[PDB]
Amino acid sequence: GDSASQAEQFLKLVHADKLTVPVYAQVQQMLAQRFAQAKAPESKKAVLERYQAKANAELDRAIGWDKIKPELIKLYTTNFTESELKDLNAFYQSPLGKKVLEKMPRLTAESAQLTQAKLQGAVEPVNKLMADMDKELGVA
Amino acid sequence: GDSASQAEQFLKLVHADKLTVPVYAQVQQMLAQRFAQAKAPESKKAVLERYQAKANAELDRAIGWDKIKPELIKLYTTNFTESELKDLNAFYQSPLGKKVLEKMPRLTAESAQLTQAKLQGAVEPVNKLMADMDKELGVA
Numbered sequence: 159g160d161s162a163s164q165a166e167q168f169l170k171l172v173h174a175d176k177l178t179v180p181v182y183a184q185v186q187q188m189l190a191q192r193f194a195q196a197k198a199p200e201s202k203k204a205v206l207e208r209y210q211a212k213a214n215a216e217l218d219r220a221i222g223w224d225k226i227k228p229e230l231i232k233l234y235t236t237n238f239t240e241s242e243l244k245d246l247n248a249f250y251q252s253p254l255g256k257k258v259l260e261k262m263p264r265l266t267a268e269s270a271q272l273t274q275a276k277l278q279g280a281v282e283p284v285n286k287l288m289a290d291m292d293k294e295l296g297v298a
Numbered sequence: 299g300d301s302a303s304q305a306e307q308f309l310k311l312v313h314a315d316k317l318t319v320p321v322y323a324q325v326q327q328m329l330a331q332r333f334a335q336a337k338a339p340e341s342k343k344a345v346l347e348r349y350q351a352k353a354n355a356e357l358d359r360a361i362g363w364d365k366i367k368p369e370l371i372k373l374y375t376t377n378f379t380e381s382e383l384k385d386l387n388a389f390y391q392s393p394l395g396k397k398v399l400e401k402m403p404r405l406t407a408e409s410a411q412l413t414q415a416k417l418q419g420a421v422e423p424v425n426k427l428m429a430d431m432d433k434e435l436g437v438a
């Protein structure tokens with residue numbers, strides 16, 4: 159019924175269209191890295207300009223929002239009811255919903271930096287640990 | 299004020315304690331892989347049992363929930379008000395909140411498999427594209 163419209167509104171509110179940005183950036187940085195890698199005359203950077211446009215168009219063919227959007231709507235309409243999607247929209251339309259969306263990438267990154275920093279403390283003991291098992295079983 | 303209690307309830311509802319499970323699994327699979335790698339007498343698997351317990355205890359020292367929990371509460375209480383955290387708890391306590399929490403890992407995985415599958419279609423054209431730029435600039 160009116161589920162697809164609510165699913166579409168959800169993907170907009172959640173900025174699911176920007177999920178591909180890392181792929182477009184990686185291919186753009188790869189070309190400039192390939193341009194530098196050999197020769198690199200800054201007088202011919204307009205040649206890199208068209209090859210970066212070509213790569214952008216080729217990604218748009220495979221992973222453009224118009225290709226992704228239909229299959230994500232099927233994903234949400236099959237997993238949620240029209241009423242559930244409407245309520246998800248009400249939450250993400252709300253000031254708190256918008257606050258969660260902006261904070262989440264940074265909160266996730268800060269949360270992961272914290273754990274990775276702490277985990278480095280277990281590197282030396284786990285290295286010693288495996289070395290002791292290899293010693294005990296008679297290895298090297 | 300009563301923010302820390304609400305932050306603690308949030309981390310419980312969201313299962314932030316299970317965020318470390320991949321690290322514990324990787325270190326457990328690494329020891330069994332190291333056990334197989336050289337010799338491997340199944341009569342001495344009780345030796346791997348204690349080394350896997352040792353590794354579990356060493357990770358608990360660095361990245362145990364008791365070490366992670368205090369710094370995540372500071373993260374949420376500084377980024378959200380007590381009232382905002384209370385409302386986040388109301389949403390994730392609700393049947394729809396619980397449905398979102400269960401669906402999200404699978405919806406994220408399915409969403410990423412879809413994009414990666416489509417992206418493989420742009421592999422050959424982007425490879426040809428870079429090869430043509432290397433050809434045009436006079437490389438190999």
Ligand SMILES: [Cl-]
Nearest residue numbers: 252253254255
């Ligand atoms: Cl609100």
Ligand SMILES: [Cl-]
Nearest residue numbers: 392393394395
């Ligand atoms: Cl509900």
